[PDB]
């Protein structure tokens, strides 16, 4: 029935279409535009959540928390490049000590 | 009370595909809702310029596809374009 079920998507094609219209991004929005964009947003959502789920498992947690989103983003090459100008609340930083600082003896 | 829409249910639906036993905190959910809103605005804002530069009134799936290839890096663009093309293919094949 609904366009998301036609596209095979979880993300809301109809709402993406509404936002494309009301954002004034163009005088008109083609019928394939929200289907394609919803599929891209769903993919990127799945890509982060896949990695964050693994980061959660590595911390024995069952619930993803911002720590795991920061770990998922910053450990992944393309996602770190996509989110290079993004700061994540409560994310922290990657564990990283410059090798010259370690107590070589 | 005034009603505020968000992507929360859809991120959760996708989460239960990738990691059925995993959950997500409301702070992490707020971040994921922010992420989707940001990436939406980037692609739509680029596709708008791609339409304008071509003097064309419509944002089509073709404007989205180029905007994705411009914005997303590396393999992430290649997979995203694959998912987008498959979705539009299935959608236009619907009755």
């Amino acid at each position: 029935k609904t366009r998301s079920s036609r596209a095979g998507l979880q993300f809301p094609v109809g709402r993406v279409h509404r936002l494309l219209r009301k954002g004034n991004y163009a005088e008109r929005v083609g019928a394939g535009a929200p289907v394609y964009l919803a599929a891209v947003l769903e993919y990127l959502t799945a890509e982060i959540l896949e990695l964050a789920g693994n980061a959660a498992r590595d911390n024995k947690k069952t619930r993803i928390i911002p720590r795991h989103l920061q770990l998922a983003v910053r450990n992944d090459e393309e996602l770190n490049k996509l989110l290079g100008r993004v700061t994540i609340a409560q994310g922290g930083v990657l564990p990283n000590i410059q090798s010259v600082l370690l107590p070589k003896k | 009370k005034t009603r505020k829409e968000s992507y929360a249910i859809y991120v959760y639906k996708v989460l239960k595909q990738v990691h059925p036993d995993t959950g997500i905190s409301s702070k992490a959910m707020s971040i994921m809702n922010s992420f989707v809103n940001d990436v939406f605005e980037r692609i739509a804002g680029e596709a708008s310029r791609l339409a304008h530069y071509n003097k064309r009134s419509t944002i089509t799936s073709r404007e989205i596809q180029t905007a994705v290839r411009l914005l997303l890096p590396g393999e992430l663009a290649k997979h995203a374009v694959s998912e987008g093309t498959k979705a539009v293919t299935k959608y236009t094949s619907a009755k």
Binding site: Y43, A46, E47 | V18, H79, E83
Partner: peptide, 4 residues
């Protein structure tokens, strides 16, 4: 690889 990557998802989906």
């Amino acid at each position: 690889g990557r998802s989906l």
